[PDB]
């Protein structure tokens with residue numbers, strides 16, 4: 001068994017609600033496809049405000065309902081991420097404006113930066129911040145990341 005090693009970094013503002021859901025989902029997919037050894041996956045924040053914190057409790061329990069677990073600590077996106085990751089996928093256009101800005105700060109930017117939702121077969125471009133929502137909104141977010149990541153993998157696979 002042999003292919004190339006591919007890398008994806010999932011990005012949100014805080015790296016507490018959404019990017020850990022999208023990251024964990026994506027890991028479960030790869031693991032389920034027997035393709036983990038070919039993938040490098042991680043999640044990070046635009047902001048430094050929550051570095052080191054654990055994922056929201058609502059994200060945590062939501063992933064559990066689906067039999068998924070995570071051990072992520074929040075970390076900030078850095079300049080080297082633009083040189084090391086094949087893909088940076090974010091949640092919203094704000095995340096997107098911010099990364100492009102920072103990427104400029106890099107000379108040799110090899111990362112393709114895009115909205116995760118741009119992969120959604122249902123076309124919901126945007127993945128809403130569920131922080132102030134309740135438990136059904138987290139379930140809605142999980143659902144979108146599932147759609148998107150399944151579609152992302154299948155074309156980069």
Ligand code: VO4
Pocket residue numbers: 012013014015016017018019129130131
């Ligand atoms: O942790 V995030 O989804 O930015 O809230």
